Scaffold this active site. Structure first.
Site, PDB file in Angstrom:
ATOM      1  N   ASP A  35      53.654   2.693  10.035  1.00 51.81           N
ATOM      2  CA  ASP A  35      53.768   2.807  11.488  1.00 51.81           C
ATOM      3  C   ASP A  35      53.784   1.409  12.099  1.00 51.81           C
ATOM      4  O   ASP A  35      52.721   0.801  12.287  1.00 51.81           O
ATOM      5  CB  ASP A  35      52.581   3.597  12.028  1.00 51.81           C
ATOM      6  CG  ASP A  35      52.617   3.755  13.521  1.00 51.81           C
ATOM      7  OD1 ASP A  35      53.675   3.467  14.110  1.00 51.81           O
ATOM      8  OD2 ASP A  35      51.590   4.187  14.095  1.00 51.81           O
ATOM      9  N   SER A 199      66.586  -4.978  24.182  1.00 56.80           N
ATOM     10  CA  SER A 199      67.965  -4.623  23.910  1.00 56.80           C
ATOM     11  C   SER A 199      68.850  -5.086  25.060  1.00 56.80           C
ATOM     12  O   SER A 199      68.434  -5.114  26.223  1.00 56.80           O
ATOM     13  CB  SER A 199      68.072  -3.107  23.717  1.00 56.80           C
ATOM     14  OG  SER A 199      69.413  -2.671  23.611  1.00 56.80           O
TER      15      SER A 199
END
EC number: 3.4.23.22
Length: 330
Positions: A35, A199
């Site tokens: 994770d 992004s």
């Protein structure tokens, strides 16, 4: 040193991925959910409340000659999905794919929430976010990667998650045969303890690319792709009959639909998520309404590039003094 381990989807939907991890001496192999959005290595154990164990493999520290109770240490964690667990702490030898750390903090669960009990395939979590998020008290502990870093050939790990197929976590090296083209690296902020990056935009299907900054985290422990409501609405508007359902808890779409791809930007590069990766199947057995793999982050507080996005890429988690992330197509 290096390590390399295969990671396997837990079910036919790729809801999560499990990777075998050797703990203790002799080894006890548990299948952990790696994770990158958390920083605790915790396991089902011989100390876990018996009624909260339903098919998981447990770690029994009393059977490990290298286990040592970390005196006074406790831990307690709550995840973004509302699940939680807590317990005490041992140090022990932990190996992943041939890479061994001695003295790793292994957090033994005394209590786990129902969603963990109900998933017999996941024996615990192995956190790969920054150690500043580790919950052990009163002395915070380091992640497996942080403990291994100095010994690794290069201070990196890579995630190569499969679509409906196994994939690979590598530590200490970048397998140049595992991706196409080049890896584009992008800046990371560690201020929240995550692999947080920005992004450069998105496209829906064959549509034009929209240049826009989308801050989010690279999180292998989250199944879906959670993005701003504007972006998610633009995606689902291209699927006839798709709608946001308050009762179901997100966007659903007719199972007869063909889904468009979704592209996200990494610098000037582009990662294309095929439409099929966005199908999470019937909302309940036999339903013709299917759950979408791209959902709004509006109720989270952060955008999350979970498995839906990451499995479309070869992803480099560069833990150099100034960390960065890398993405390549594959």
């Amino acid at each position: 040193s290096t390590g390399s381990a295969t990671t396997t989807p837990i079910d036919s939907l790729d809801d999560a991925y499990i990777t075998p991890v050797q703990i203790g001496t002799p080894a006890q192999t548990l299948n952990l959910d790696f994770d990158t959005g958390s920083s605790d290595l915790w396991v089902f154990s011989s100390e876990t409340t018996a009624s909260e164990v339903d098919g998981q493999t447990i770690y029994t520290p009393s059977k490990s000659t290298t286990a040592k109770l970390l005196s006074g240490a406790t831990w307690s964690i709550s995840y973004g999905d509302g699940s939680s667990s807590s317990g005490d702490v041992y140090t022990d030898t932990v190996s992943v794919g041939g890479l061994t750390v001695t003295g790793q903090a292994v957090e033994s669960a005394k209590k786990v929430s129902s969603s963990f009990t109900e998933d017999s395939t996941i024996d615990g979590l192995l956190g790969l976010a920054f150690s500043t998020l580790n919950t052990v008290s009163p002395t915070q502990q380091k992640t497996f990667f942080d403990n291994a870093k100095a010994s690794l050939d290069s201070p990196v790990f890579t995630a190569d998650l499969g679509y409906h197929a196994p994939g690979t976590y590598n530590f200490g090296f970048i397998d140049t045969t595992a991706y196409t083209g080049s890896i584009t690296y992008t800046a990371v902020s560690t201020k929240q303890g995550f692999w947080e990056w920005t992004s450069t935009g998105y496209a829906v299907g064959s549509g034009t690319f929209k240049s826009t900054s989308i801050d989010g985290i690279a999180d292998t422990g989250t199944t879906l792709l959670y993005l701003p409501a504007t972006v998610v609405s633009a995606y689902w508007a291209q699927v006839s009959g798709a709608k946001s359902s308050s009762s179901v808890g997100g966007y659903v779409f007719p199972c007869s639909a063909t889904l468009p791809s979704f592209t996200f930007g990494v610098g000037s590069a582009r990662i294309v998520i095929p439409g099929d990766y966005i199908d999470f199947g019937p909302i309940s057995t036999g339903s013709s309404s299917c759950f979408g793999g791209i959902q709004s982050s509006a109720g989270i507080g952060i955008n999350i590039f979970g498995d839906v996005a990451l499995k479309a890429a070869f992803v480099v988690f560069n833990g150099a003094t100034t960390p960065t992330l890398g993405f390549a197509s594959k």
